[PDB]
């Protein structure tokens, strides 16, 4: 029950780092909730954006 990004000290989430984001989507592709991941609020935001950028650029899917 700890934040990835507060643990590992990661200030900047990147949309391009597909692997990293892939942790935080469901198998279907849906964004995983904060309560499941344990993410910090702040980052949950950052993370959401990135995935949203990602998905736009076809890096990630909207519906796997």
């Amino acid at each position: 029950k700890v934040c990835y990004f507060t643990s590992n000290g990661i200030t900047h989430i990147d949309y391009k780092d597909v692997d990293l984001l892939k942790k935080f989507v469901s198998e279907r592709g849906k964004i995983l909730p904060r309560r499941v991941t344990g993410t910090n609020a702040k980052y949950q935001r950052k993370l959401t954006a990135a995935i949203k950028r990602a998905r736009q650029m076809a890096l990630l899917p909207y519906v796997s």
């Binding site: 900047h12 949309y15 391009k16 950028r53 998905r55 736009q56 650029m57 076809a58 890096l59 990630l60 899917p61 909207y62």
Partner: protein
């Protein structure tokens, strides 16, 4: 002028002569409109997460720049027009 990150995907059905021409074209666009290319990755042909314009793969180019809007804006304009670039995004580099 302020830092942006352009990414874009080139259609997968081109040879490396054509591809280079694309890159040089669009690199020429930016620097023509007062941009300076600080970085230029090439992620190479990836599988797309879904099928864009009937292609399941594409060549990603990631240009860092520093420029005025005008530059980026011109790029975006042309990027849209072009059939070689299938999708793109410009993004500001958050401070």
């Amino acid at each position: 002028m302020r830092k942006y990150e352009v990414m874009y995907i080139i259609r997968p059905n081109i040879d490396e002569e054509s591809k280079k021409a694309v890159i040089e074209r669009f690199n020429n666009v930016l620097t023509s409109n007062g941009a300076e290319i600080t970085g230029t990755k090439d992620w190479g042909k990836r599988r797309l997460a879904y099928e864009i314009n009937d292609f399941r793969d594409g060549f990603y180019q990631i240009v860092n720049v520093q420029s005025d809007a005008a530059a980026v804006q011109e790029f975006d304009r042309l990027a849209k027009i072009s059939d070689d670039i299938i999708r793109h995004i410009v993004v500001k580099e958050e401070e």
